[PDB]
Amino acid sequence: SVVSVISRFLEEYLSSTPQRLKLLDAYLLYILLTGALQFGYCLLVGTFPFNSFLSGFISCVGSFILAVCLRIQINPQNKADFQGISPERAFADFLFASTILHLVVMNFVG
Amino acid sequence: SYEKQDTLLKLLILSMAAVLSFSTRLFAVLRFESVIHEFDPYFNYRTTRFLAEEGFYKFHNWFDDRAWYPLGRIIGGTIYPGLMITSAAIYHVLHFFHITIDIRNVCVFLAPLFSSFTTIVTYHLTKELKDAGAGLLAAAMIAVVPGYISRSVAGSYDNEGIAIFCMLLTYYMWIKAVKTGSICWAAKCALAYFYMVSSWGGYVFLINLIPLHVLVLMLTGRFSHRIYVAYCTVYCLGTILSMQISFVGFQPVLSSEHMAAFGVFGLCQIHAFVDYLRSKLNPQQFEVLFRSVISLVGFVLLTVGALLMLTGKISPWTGRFYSLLDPSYAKNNIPIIASVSEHQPTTWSSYYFDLQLLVFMFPVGLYYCFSNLSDARIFIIMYGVTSMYFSAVMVRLMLVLAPVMCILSGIGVSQVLSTYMKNLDISRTYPIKNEVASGMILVMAFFLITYTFHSTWVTSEAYSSPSIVLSARGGDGSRIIFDDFREAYYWLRHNTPEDAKVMSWWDYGYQITAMANRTILVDNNTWNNTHISRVGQAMASTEEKAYEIMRELDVSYVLVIFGGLTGYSSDDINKFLWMVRIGGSTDTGKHIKENDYYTPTGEFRVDREGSPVLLNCLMYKMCYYRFGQVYTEAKRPPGFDRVRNAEIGNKDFELDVLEEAYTTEHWLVRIYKVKDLDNRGLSRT
Amino acid sequence: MITDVQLAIFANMLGVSLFLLVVLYHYVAVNNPKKQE
Amino acid sequence: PSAMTVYALVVVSYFLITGGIIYDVIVEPPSVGSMTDEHGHQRPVAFLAYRVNGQYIMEGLASSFLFTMGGLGFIILDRSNAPNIPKLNRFLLLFIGFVCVLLSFFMARVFMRMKLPGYLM
Amino acid sequence: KRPPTVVSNTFTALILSPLLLLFALWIRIGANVSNFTFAPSTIIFHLGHAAMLGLMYVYWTQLNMFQTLKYLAILGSVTFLAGNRMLAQQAVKRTA
Amino acid sequence: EFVRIDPFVRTFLKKKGGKYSVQFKLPDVYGVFQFKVDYNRLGYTHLYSSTQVSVRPLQHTQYERFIPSAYPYYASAFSMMLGLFIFSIVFLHM
């Protein structure tokens, strides 16, 4: 029964995962629970003003994807794949891209 | 030390390539003048000098009431401003140092500068695909490639000058991102994309090639986390940046031209998550969830991908881009797009004429990219194979093909040279192998020299003639010049009321607006086909009926271009059939039928055998007024037309609602004043 | 002023010199030991 | 499919596309023209002269065939550089690929000299 | 007419709740700042970054783009210098 | 009359203050309009007057701002930037 497979999922995940990654997996959940609720609003009240909806939504999707990219560049299991990238360079890049994102959404929110 | 000599030889080669790229485009300035060519560049020039004078915020808000009277045009809402912003920035930088260059010169010489920078961008872009020895070849090839020069000669101030620089810079940044897997390079690729989106309408090509590359990397099973980070970052950033441009608006989200990228984004997420669950669960515990989850989320996507189209909520393909997917559409559905002979499909002759050696070397660069596949080389394979098709659909797009043709020809020739030059490593059948290698190296040197002489000949003879001026050679070989276009526009500029409205066919609208500074009815950017049809109906209709339209639109003057005294084949008489078609295309025009102007035999001719409606339309009467008595040639009777090679049929007539205001020295341009309403209420019959 | 013939000659000579120099570069590359160690 | 099996399809596509089949389909010219003899008969003409922007159906296949021989010649040579191949074959490959590379180029340049009287003149 | 203001204010207050759930997770999972230090670069970095994020409200309310970039160049330069120094220090400490 | 090609508005000018005048709201449509007066009456002189007047679309600064229907979308970005900041605080110093 699927509840049993989910139990065998969480029994692993909670044991296997460094704390700095659980932190990210909670931040991603906050992002996703904000974006899903913006969407459920948009399709309840209506598309106007499409500018502000599309800005706040793409701001959520962008912050989610930048968080997943941090969640992947920093993971030691991928050091063989992102050669030459230290965790600190990945964090500087994450703040660079998040700065561009929060500038352009501020262009588009209005 | 060896490193010094390698660096010296790289620097020397690249600086010669840059100097050649800049210098080969000057032929047009040396032959005539530092002046802007063609029709379309004049709108870019006027808008650039506007931005250089009024400042950004007044250019962006700018609304122009001198064009498309009485509708006007929203300029900043309907333009790609990147070229103008670039020119204004360079202008202000030079003026800051008090290098007070005239803005016209900055515009004229802007294209050579960026067509020099593209040689360095092409060097690095090829170096990252192969080695520096291939990048030097690709630079030297793209320096002179005539297909690119054809759109980039000095004074050819049009977007295609900047677009290929932004395009190659975007491909360099994307290749760096995919090779490296770094968010920094993804954000720099997003900024390069945003720059390109601001500067040319062809950005849809990149936002449709990159998703296809990612898809091909998935199907091959090469997809790995570097591609996920690159794609999802380039997608979110380039989307929210491209949506900034007011002419782009919501199209990146609400148009089927961009849904390929969103589909690949969603499928990247599904694949990145299945790759994780398959890594956590055991097979017997994975398979049930795998098949169930796919049988739900695939069904969701399969439904939404239908609903989006069936509702029409996602806009369908625009007729232009669809005419790129189906060559037959525009010739049946939009005669404006049909009328521009630049949209004809490409024959083998133009491929040889514009590329020569590259046509022979491109399959070898492809053979190398297929021999040594890699996650970055699949990009160049896809770019090549896509441009090879789209260039065949429409000659104008050869510009997009020339860069990849040069990169692949450079890879191929590099692989040949570096193959055979290894057999010449004597210095630290063997004599046969050495003479074979020497002969093949000589053959390659010979080919590369012939490519230089071909490209220089083509650049000199074909693509360097202007079009605001006409040229001929007298029997002594002196250049005869006809300036009649500028003479007529200057006469308009000085000797007519400053509020007068000049009616003209839509080709000349940018010229009248730039040189004459008078209001016009219709213009090259045919954003209102109804208005163009309303002008064609007035040109094609009879002189009694056309007056009601000219008085309806409050016209002051009408201008026609007549070649029959000089053999200028591009006159308004040849355009007449297109003016008839467009005038009859609107429902208000159904009395205008093309079959009425042909003779019963089914031919168009203006001599005595011509249709009695053709001989009485407004345009024929404007072109051939008084002309019937001109001794056009010594062996020909009076009224011989140099272009139809026919003696006109209706020689003597009076104009009743127009008076001849000015006919230029060679009659090349004729302008009439539409007579004011008769003072006594008499009818004009 | 320089004519378009003098420019055409100058550009032909730059082109030939460029391609001959690249065909030298390929030799200076392949003779390198460090490129193949 | 394997990489070679895709490359073969791309080469075969290059043949047709470079021969301008997309021009033939929609403009649909004949394979050759004909022109009056001084005695009034018709001689066929293979090339639409002076029209750089125009083509007959077979002219494009002829030109693209020369282009394909030129492209494949270097592939034959690079194949020819292998050390396993008995030398009596090797000197052939250096023959066939070399004469492909030269003769196809020269014939294409002559065909373009035929299309444009005044080309490089 | 618009949609009713009572639902606008409803959703505008509902969207704050995920920011409470974030803290309700972090506090109860084990989050910490005990590795923080008062080294000058570490304070200057967070000051610069906080001001960089605050500038976006002033841009949204008052400034234009050219003014915003004329401030953000300076504030990003100083934040980048302090971030680079602080991250180098952290990298050494991590790798020791 | 207020005319672009056909008349968009036609109204009587009131006799006020020694002058003929009217106050009215311009149409929803931008273009190069003309005011016209065309007092053609039997036996009186034909009076014609016209003044060309361009009507332009709104400037981008004049669009509506702080629409209260959109407060959720403002609170979204002003939540995301705060979450990002607090995360940048915790991630480095945990």
PDB file of N, CA and C in Angstrom, chain B residues 399-428:
ATOM      1  N   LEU B 399      21.613  35.043 -43.695  1.00  0.00           N
ATOM      2  CA  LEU B 399      22.423  35.697 -42.675  1.00  0.00           C
ATOM      3  C   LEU B 399      22.641  34.774 -41.485  1.00  0.00           C
ATOM      4  N   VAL B 400      21.595  34.058 -41.067  1.00  0.00           N
ATOM      5  CA  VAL B 400      21.709  33.171 -39.917  1.00  0.00           C
ATOM      6  C   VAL B 400      22.557  31.952 -40.248  1.00  0.00           C
ATOM      7  N   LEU B 401      22.641  31.582 -41.527  1.00  0.00           N
ATOM      8  CA  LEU B 401      23.380  30.386 -41.911  1.00  0.00           C
ATOM      9  C   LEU B 401      24.870  30.664 -42.043  1.00  0.00           C
ATOM     10  N   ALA B 402      25.231  31.853 -42.515  1.00  0.00           N
ATOM     11  CA  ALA B 402      26.642  32.149 -42.748  1.00  0.00           C
ATOM     12  C   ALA B 402      27.533  31.920 -41.531  1.00  0.00           C
ATOM     13  N   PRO B 403      27.159  32.325 -40.314  1.00  0.00           N
ATOM     14  CA  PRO B 403      28.049  32.071 -39.162  1.00  0.00           C
ATOM     15  C   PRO B 403      28.335  30.599 -38.909  1.00  0.00           C
ATOM     16  N   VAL B 404      27.296  29.764 -38.853  1.00  0.00           N
ATOM     17  CA  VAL B 404      27.522  28.344 -38.600  1.00  0.00           C
ATOM     18  C   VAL B 404      28.258  27.695 -39.763  1.00  0.00           C
ATOM     19  N   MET B 405      27.997  28.142 -40.993  1.00  0.00           N
ATOM     20  CA  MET B 405      28.761  27.635 -42.126  1.00  0.00           C
ATOM     21  C   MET B 405      30.241  27.950 -41.970  1.00  0.00           C
ATOM     22  N   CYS B 406      30.561  29.142 -41.459  1.00  0.00           N
ATOM     23  CA  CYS B 406      31.964  29.490 -41.258  1.00  0.00           C
ATOM     24  C   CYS B 406      32.579  28.678 -40.128  1.00  0.00           C
ATOM     25  N   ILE B 407      31.844  28.491 -39.031  1.00  0.00           N
ATOM     26  CA  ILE B 407      32.387  27.737 -37.905  1.00  0.00           C
ATOM     27  C   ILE B 407      32.671  26.297 -38.319  1.00  0.00           C
ATOM     28  N   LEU B 408      31.737  25.675 -39.043  1.00  0.00           N
ATOM     29  CA  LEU B 408      31.930  24.286 -39.443  1.00  0.00           C
ATOM     30  C   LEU B 408      32.993  24.151 -40.526  1.00  0.00           C
ATOM     31  N   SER B 409      33.076  25.111 -41.452  1.00  0.00           N
ATOM     32  CA  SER B 409      34.146  25.067 -42.442  1.00  0.00           C
ATOM     33  C   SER B 409      35.505  25.235 -41.780  1.00  0.00           C
ATOM     34  N   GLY B 410      35.576  26.065 -40.740  1.00  0.00           N
ATOM     35  CA  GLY B 410      36.824  26.216 -40.020  1.00  0.00           C
ATOM     36  C   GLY B 410      37.214  24.958 -39.274  1.00  0.00           C
ATOM     37  N   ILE B 411      36.239  24.283 -38.660  1.00  0.00           N
ATOM     38  CA  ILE B 411      36.535  23.010 -38.005  1.00  0.00           C
ATOM     39  C   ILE B 411      37.041  21.997 -39.027  1.00  0.00           C
ATOM     40  N   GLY B 412      36.377  21.914 -40.179  1.00  0.00           N
ATOM     41  CA  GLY B 412      36.776  20.933 -41.178  1.00  0.00           C
ATOM     42  C   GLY B 412      38.175  21.183 -41.713  1.00  0.00           C
ATOM     43  N   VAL B 413      38.443  22.421 -42.135  1.00  0.00           N
ATOM     44  CA  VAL B 413      39.756  22.742 -42.681  1.00  0.00           C
ATOM     45  C   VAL B 413      40.828  22.592 -41.609  1.00  0.00           C
ATOM     46  N   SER B 414      40.514  22.974 -40.367  1.00  0.00           N
ATOM     47  CA  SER B 414      41.451  22.761 -39.273  1.00  0.00           C
ATOM     48  C   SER B 414      41.784  21.286 -39.109  1.00  0.00           C
ATOM     49  N   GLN B 415      40.776  20.413 -39.180  1.00  0.00           N
ATOM     50  CA  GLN B 415      41.044  18.990 -39.012  1.00  0.00           C
ATOM     51  C   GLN B 415      41.859  18.429 -40.165  1.00  0.00           C
ATOM     52  N   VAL B 416      41.643  18.934 -41.377  1.00  0.00           N
ATOM     53  CA  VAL B 416      42.446  18.480 -42.510  1.00  0.00           C
ATOM     54  C   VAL B 416      43.893  18.929 -42.342  1.00  0.00           C
ATOM     55  N   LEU B 417      44.094  20.229 -42.131  1.00  0.00           N
ATOM     56  CA  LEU B 417      45.441  20.761 -41.964  1.00  0.00           C
ATOM     57  C   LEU B 417      46.175  20.059 -40.828  1.00  0.00           C
ATOM     58  N   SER B 418      45.558  19.985 -39.646  1.00  0.00           N
ATOM     59  CA  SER B 418      46.219  19.374 -38.499  1.00  0.00           C
ATOM     60  C   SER B 418      46.373  17.867 -38.642  1.00  0.00           C
ATOM     61  N   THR B 419      45.623  17.235 -39.546  1.00  0.00           N
ATOM     62  CA  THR B 419      45.869  15.834 -39.857  1.00  0.00           C
ATOM     63  C   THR B 419      47.126  15.682 -40.700  1.00  0.00           C
ATOM     64  N   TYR B 420      47.158  16.348 -41.855  1.00  0.00           N
ATOM     65  CA  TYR B 420      48.269  16.144 -42.782  1.00  0.00           C
ATOM     66  C   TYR B 420      49.567  16.783 -42.298  1.00  0.00           C
ATOM     67  N   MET B 421      49.493  17.864 -41.524  1.00  0.00           N
ATOM     68  CA  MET B 421      50.698  18.502 -41.011  1.00  0.00           C
ATOM     69  C   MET B 421      51.389  17.663 -39.945  1.00  0.00           C
ATOM     70  N   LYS B 422      50.704  16.660 -39.392  1.00  0.00           N
ATOM     71  CA  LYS B 422      51.371  15.711 -38.509  1.00  0.00           C
ATOM     72  C   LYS B 422      52.293  14.776 -39.280  1.00  0.00           C
ATOM     73  N   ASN B 423      51.944  14.446 -40.525  1.00  0.00           N
ATOM     74  CA  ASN B 423      52.830  13.639 -41.353  1.00  0.00           C
ATOM     75  C   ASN B 423      54.075  14.403 -41.787  1.00  0.00           C
ATOM     76  N   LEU B 424      54.016  15.732 -41.809  1.00  0.00           N
ATOM     77  CA  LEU B 424      55.184  16.569 -42.054  1.00  0.00           C
ATOM     78  C   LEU B 424      56.010  16.830 -40.800  1.00  0.00           C
ATOM     79  N   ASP B 425      55.749  16.133 -39.694  1.00  0.00           N
ATOM     80  CA  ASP B 425      56.601  16.258 -38.516  1.00  0.00           C
ATOM     81  C   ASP B 425      57.924  15.521 -38.704  1.00  0.00           C
ATOM     82  N   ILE B 426      58.582  15.754 -39.841  1.00  0.00           N
ATOM     83  CA  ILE B 426      59.941  15.261 -40.050  1.00  0.00           C
ATOM     84  C   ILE B 426      60.909  15.927 -39.083  1.00  0.00           C
ATOM     85  N   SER B 427      60.661  17.193 -38.744  1.00  0.00           N
ATOM     86  CA  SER B 427      61.691  18.045 -38.159  1.00  0.00           C
ATOM     87  C   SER B 427      62.268  17.494 -36.863  1.00  0.00           C
ATOM     88  N   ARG B 428      61.566  16.600 -36.171  1.00  0.00           N
ATOM     89  CA  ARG B 428      62.142  15.882 -35.034  1.00  0.00           C
ATOM     90  C   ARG B 428      61.698  14.423 -35.041  1.00  0.00           C
TER      91      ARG B 428
END
